Structures are given as C-alpha cells and as structure tokens.
Motif scaffolding. Structure first.
Motif: not given
Ligand SMILES: [Zn+2]
Ligand SMILES: [Zn+2]
Lengths: 21, 30, 30, 21, 30, 30, 21, 21, 30, 21, 30, 21
Positions: D11-13, F17-24
């Motif tokens: 689940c995304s944000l 969590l903010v970035c998702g599969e993009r990473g950071f």
C-alpha cells in the motif's frame, strides 16, 4: 489527550490502556 | 512496563503492542 | 504463514506519518 | 480492513491515507 | 510470499546505523 | 502528511515510505 | 541488489556496509 | 541537505520528495 | 521462509517496552 | 526460546514478560 | 558505524544488529 | 552501564560490542 498524558508526562500501562479500543 | 515518556511513533508502537487484537486510537490533536 | 502481526507494527508506523494530526484508528476487526 | 489489503500487497501513502480520520 | 517491503524498512534502518555519515542510496532497481 | 521534525532513523523511514519503488538518497553530511 | 541478497538470507553489518557511499 | 531541512526545521511531503530518486 | 531475523528486531523492541528497567537478554541459542 | 515461541505464533505482553530479568 | 547518541529502542536495535547470532544484554538500570 | 556510555555519551562499534554476549 494521549500526547499530553503519555509524551509530556509518563503513562503507566493502565493509563496507556485507556487508549485501546 | 517501561516508565518513560513515549513520543511520536514510539507511542503508536507502545499502543500497538499493549492493546493486542483490540486495536487502539491515536489522536494527537489537542 | 506470512506475518500480519509484524506487518501491523509497520502499518501503524506508516499511518502515524501519513495521517499526522488527523490521527487514526487501527482495528484489525471487520 | 487494512491488514488484508496492505499486508497481502503493498500500500502506497495514498492507499494508507484512506484509513486516517 | 515473504515480504521484501517490510524487509526493506529494516534494511534502510540497518543502513542508517552502518553507513553513518557516509550516507547511502536505496535502489530496489537493478 | 505529519508536520514535525523527523530525525535520524525516523527521517530514513519517512523517506522509505514517501518515495516508494523510486528509492531515495540519505546524505546527512553537511 | 540489497533486497535480493539481504531479504532472502541474513546480511551482517559487514555485508550491509558494501551498500554505503 | 536533508538533516538541516527536515530535522532542524520541518519538511512538507513535497520537500521530502526532493530526496527521492 | 518466514523471517525470524525481521521478527527478532520487533521482538527486542517489544522486550524493551515490556521489561523496562528489569532489562533483558536476547539469546536465539538454546 | 523466544524466537521459536513468538515468531511462529503471536506473543502478548504477558508472554513476552517471561523473558525479562 | 554511526557516531551519535543512541537511546531507548534505538540502542536495543543498534545492539540487535551489531551483535548478530551472539545476542546481547540490555541493562539500563544504574 | 550502556545507557550512560552509549546514550549520555557516544559509543564506537567496539564499545557497543562490549554489550554483546
Ligand atoms: Zn526515536
Ligand atoms: Zn518488521
């Protein structure tokens, strides 16, 4: 609420259980 | 149980474990 | 199995960051 | 609820914000 | 399956302690 | 989203969590 | 990367340090 | 950088997303 | 399999809250 | 120990307190 | 490794990863 | 102990490894 009771001051387990539902 | 100030995510996690399958409510606005 | 108890702590931690001051309810009961 | 939709898949944000108040 | 999303949070937490000031990049893409 | 100071591992996890599969990228040295 | 070498098996601190800057 | 912008001071989600890649 | 390494971090975090000042020992060896 | 009784099934606070000092 | 104060659960988690299958002892009372 | 050595002041990895068993 909880921030004021448990973060500003300390909460016993009984008190923290007041925020269970 | 621990006897110290629990703030932010450490309060949510303390709630998570204390309450068990009952769940809880986190309402920080006051 | 997989582990929804370990996932639940991550879930309520994620909800603490996303909801902020709106707060939330965690009920694994429906 | 959230445990069956977000522990079985990611689940995304945005999907998580649905369960806020 | 198992859970590499839950493992990834643990992974980036572990890398915050190990790398310190060298910092890091987390790319689940290769 | 949460509106507070996020430090140390709480910043890395907010990034995760903010970035998702993009990473950071986490680069604390300044 | 790290997700396939360290979530499929345990990675020590030393194995994790390889992915630092 | 991020410590200075997001820990010393506060970061909106847009700003924290500047550190995504 | 499942993941007892990821479970162990949650376990020692849980024990930090439950034991408080009594402290603990974590030995995955028996 | 704790890894085989509490990672294979859920352990409440009460079951976890058994492993304290 | 990280070069900063590690307190509460952040000390337990630093211990958890540093020590590996050796385990550790957390004794906060002094 | 550990709180005094590692939280009040800072601990190198060698020092934090004194609390491994
Ligand atoms: Zn913290
Ligand atoms: Zn986890």
């Amino acid at each position: 609420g909880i921030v004021e009771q448990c973060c500003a001051s300390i909460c016993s387990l009984y008190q923290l259980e007041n925020y269970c539902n | 149980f621990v006897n110290q100030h629990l703030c932010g995510s450490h309060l949510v996690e303390a709630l998570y474990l204390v309450c068990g399958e009952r769940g809880f409510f986190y309402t920080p606005k006051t």
